[PDB]
Ligand binder design. Structure first.
Ligand SMILES: [Mg+2]
Length: 830
């Protein structure tokens, strides 16, 4: 539909709080009578607050007592039951005229609904109302004479008004401002949707039960540690939330009756208060130690329950947010001894009660704007699993107790990694090109500044150079450094190294001489292929061949036929290239990547995107970056042509658009920062022939993805992720949804590739929880050239693949699974 303006949307949520005030400030209740007004009026006459009115007078609300005990009773099974007891709760009252107790009486069997306003009632107060209604009806069939109340709520208000001025109010405020000083203002629980700017009070609930076995074991666990059943659940829930949110401390609220003095237990009115329970979990505590910490802080809080919670918020957070509740966002209520809750004042509110069978049951109400139902159901499953582990052994570390169910674990490890695709595992990278040469020998393969090379012409040039490399000792796992700017001969060199059975080492002449000299010496190549004009000299017994110019003419005398498979002797497990990466602060590391992983990476890309022979790909990425690997070899393996961009031609700001239009470029790559420059460049709207844009290397903002759509409505935008140590890319996400999110996911693993989000102990985390990304499958590189200790540090055994010798790569990146089985990049683990 047509979207609302910013002022319309913001005002709509303000009008939604008006309905929030209608459901949150009432106390509903329903009692069914099975059997054959004197009791209703008798309850009002003895409860002074039931006939109390409220109005304004001289700049302050006043209390008006009355003596009129007159109950205002009002007089399809499925439709009338659920709906009219919902409207009875949403029925607004009037503080001035009209009573504050609403009742509906409708039919031997009759159902009487009772409703009270929160200004003169609690949840406890209706339980007192049920005590008198069940007794006054048994006496009016067989107010003050039978039993007299000791006080009235007006006297408690006079006691509170004096207590708020006394020194005991100042002392309880000093404890709370110290107990909750520096506590986290907002819990970072993983949400399925970003938190709205204004708090959405739409809520839903699920049913959770503790079976008879767990309830008994929790009672025995509580008796042994001196805690109660509510305190044991508090410790477990606080332990789970801190584990899910990735925070050391969590604050959980709890409503208390605040009727400690035995004088007020029989009265009705507004007595309920709220306590903020701050639980710490740093230092890896045990189950026994955690229960003792919760015991210290529950007792210290329940003795300071007189101070209203509103004054705790005003002292701690005089400035607060509008998107969440202050101090705490989670609530645990214990109802030791109603329609489904559809309103959520907090993110999660866990309600539990002790049933007659001894089992613990209740509900978990969640804000539907933040969580899906399945997420809340898994949340309740973790709590029950955590509680069972605490009963099994109360001496173990609480934050390492297993909480994942068997269904979610299988989904995370197996189902969301079901990427097995049958690709030829006996073919090398250059053999993919050679197979395409036989299918289309005269098709255009390479374009550079007007010059062209067909598939057969490119293959013949590469075969000549490959024979010259073979004569210089190039073979399996031997390296050949290549130092050249972009030109036709760059691709001739790369294919020739692969054809000779070696691995190419790209040396970008733009880098300073110091780094080029290190890489040239660290890779210890057999041959340096050098473009005419470059002055890089290896020494060290390395052979130097000219790549172009008159000095390259000698190896043109080599026959242009392909070398046999036994001549080169290369196999898919041999190296295809060594590309260097700088590890933060230190020397660059040469990543050894084998043929089989590159072939898998290229064959998945064609299966996913279907590049056709008629298309052109733009080679614009410096070949020291592994993005160029698929820029080179993807089009050449399927029959398309590769357009070599001018060296530093993008220094001319208009070159990129002119080349896209002039050469009918259909596919090209951008790091998100350069994509922003592209959509902001002049004439970008002329590029309507572009088919695909691949993004990788940085986080892709959703706003940039949306900007690309408005500039080029036809282009398919794809977000890819993967380190050099896992062959270019391992996950992909198509930005094809009608509405794109702000955080663009990195997607799902590619063919024959697996992903894992693990905690510090190598265990899988629940869905939505942040952990370290680990990569498995055929694209995991062999390791770092000449650096075996770091290789063992980052390339660790794979305990999931079911294959001996398989390895995972520890990325050092933080990520999390989403509900739809897609991954999200969250930044560096450090
Ligand atoms: Mg990558």
């Amino acid at each position: 539909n047509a979207p609302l303006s910013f002022a319309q949307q913001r005002l709509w949520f303000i009008a939604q709080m008006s309905r929030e005030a209608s459901g949150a400030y009432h106390v509903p209740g329903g009692l069914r009578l099975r059997g054959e007004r004197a009791a209703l009026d008798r309850i009002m006459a003895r409860h002074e607050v039931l006939r109390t009115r409220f109005e304004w007078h001289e700049g302050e609300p006043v209390q008006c007592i009355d003596a009129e005990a007159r109950f205002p009773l009002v007089r399809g099974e499925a439709a009338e039951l659920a709906h009219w007891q919902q409207v009875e709760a949403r029925s607004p009252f009037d503080l001035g005229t009209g009573p504050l107790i609403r009742g509906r009486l409708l039919k031997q069997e009759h159902v009487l609904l009772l409703t009270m306003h929160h200004i003169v009632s609690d949840g406890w107060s209706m339980s007192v109302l049920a005590h008198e209604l069940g007794t006054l009806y048994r006496a009016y069939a067989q107010v003050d004479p039978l039993p007299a109340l000791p006080l009235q709520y007006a006297d408690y208000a006079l006691w509170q008004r004096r207590w708020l001025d006394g020194e005991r109010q100042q002392r309880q405020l000093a404890y709370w401002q110290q107990q909750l000083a520096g506590a986290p203002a907002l819990v970072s629980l993983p949400t399925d949707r970003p938190r709205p700017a204004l708090q959405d009070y739409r809520g839903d609930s699920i049913e959770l039960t503790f079976d008879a076995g767990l309830s008994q074991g929790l009672r025995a666990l509580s008796q042994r540690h001196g805690t109660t059943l509510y305190m044991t659940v508090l410790a477990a829930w606080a332990a789970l939330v801190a584990r899910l949110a990735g925070q050391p401390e969590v604050v959980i609220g709890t409503p208390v009756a605040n009727r400690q003095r035995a004088e007020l237990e029989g009265l009705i009115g507004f007595f309920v208060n709220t306590l903020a329970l701050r639980v710490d979990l740093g230092g890896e505590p045990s189950v026994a130690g955690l229960l003792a910490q919760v015991r210290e802080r529950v007792l210290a809080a329940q003795s300071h329950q007189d101070l209203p919670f509103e004054q705790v918020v005003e002292a701690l957070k005089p400035e607060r947010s509008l998107s969440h509740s202050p101090v705490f966002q989670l609530m645990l209520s214990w109802e030791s001894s109603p329609v489904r809750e559809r309103s959520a004042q907090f993110d999660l509110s866990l309600h539990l009660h002790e049933a007659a069978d001894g089992t613990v049951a209740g509900s978990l109400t969640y804000a539907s704007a933040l969580y899906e139902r399945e997420t809340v159901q898994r949340h309740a499953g973790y709590l029950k699993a955590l509680l069972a582990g605490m009963v099994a052994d109360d001496t173990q570390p609480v934050q390492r107790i297993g909480i994942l169910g068997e269904a979610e674990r299988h989904r995370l490890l197996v189902e969301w990694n079901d990427t097995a695709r049958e690709h030829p595992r006996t073919v090398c990278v250059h053999e993919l090109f050679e197979q395409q040469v036989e299918r289309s020998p005269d098709a255009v393969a390479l374009v550079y500044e007007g010059q062209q090379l067909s598939y057969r012409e490119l293959d013949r040039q590469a075969n000549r150079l490959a024979r010259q490399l073979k004569a210089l000792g190039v073979g399996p796992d031997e390296r050949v450094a290549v130092c050249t700017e972009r030109c036709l001969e760059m691709v001739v060199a790369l294919l020739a190294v692969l054809k000779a059975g070696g691995a190419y080492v790209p040396l970008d002449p733009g880098y300073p001489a110091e780094r080029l000299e290190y890489m040239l010496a660290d890779s210890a190549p057999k041959v340096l292929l050098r473009q005419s004009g470059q002055t890089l000299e290896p020494g060290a017994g390395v052979a130097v061949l000219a790549l172009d110019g008159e000095a390259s003419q000698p190896w043109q005398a080599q026959p242009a036929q392909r070398l046999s498979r036994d001549d080169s002797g290369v196999q898919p497990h041999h190296l295809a290239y060594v590309i260097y990466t700088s590890g933060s602060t230190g020397r660059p590391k040469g990543v050894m990547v084998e043929h089989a992983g590159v072939v898998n990476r290229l064959l998945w890309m064609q299966r996913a995107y279907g590049l056709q022979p008629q298309e052109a790909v733009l080679q614009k990425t410096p070949f020291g970056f592994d993005v160029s690997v698929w820029e080179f070899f993807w089009p050449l393996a399927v029959g398309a042509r590769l357009v070599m961009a001018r060296p530093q031609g993008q220094q001319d700001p208009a070159y990129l658009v002119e080349t896209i239009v002039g050469q009918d470029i259909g596919t090209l790559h951008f790091v998100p920062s350069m994509l922003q420059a592209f959509v902001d460049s002049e004439g970008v709207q002329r590029c309507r022939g572009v088919r695909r844009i691949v993004c990788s290397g940085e986080a892709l903002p959703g706003a940039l993805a949306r900007r690309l759509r408005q500039q080029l409505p036809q282009v398919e935008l794809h977000n890819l992720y993967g380190p050099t140590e896992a062959t270019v890319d391992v996950t992909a996400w198509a930005c094809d949804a009608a509405e794109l999110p702000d955080n663009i996911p990195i997607g799902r693993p590619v063919d024959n590739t697996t992903m894992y989000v693990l905690d510090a102990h190598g265990q899988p985390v629940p869905t939505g929880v942040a952990g370290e990304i680990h990569i498995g499958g055929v694209q995991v590189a062999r390791g770092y050239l000449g650096r075996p200790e770091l290789t063992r540090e980052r390339f660790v055994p794979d305990p999931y693949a079911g294959r001996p010798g398989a390895r995972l790569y520890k990325t050092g990146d933080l990520g999390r699974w989403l509900l739809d089985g897609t991954l999200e990049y969250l930044g560096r683990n450090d």
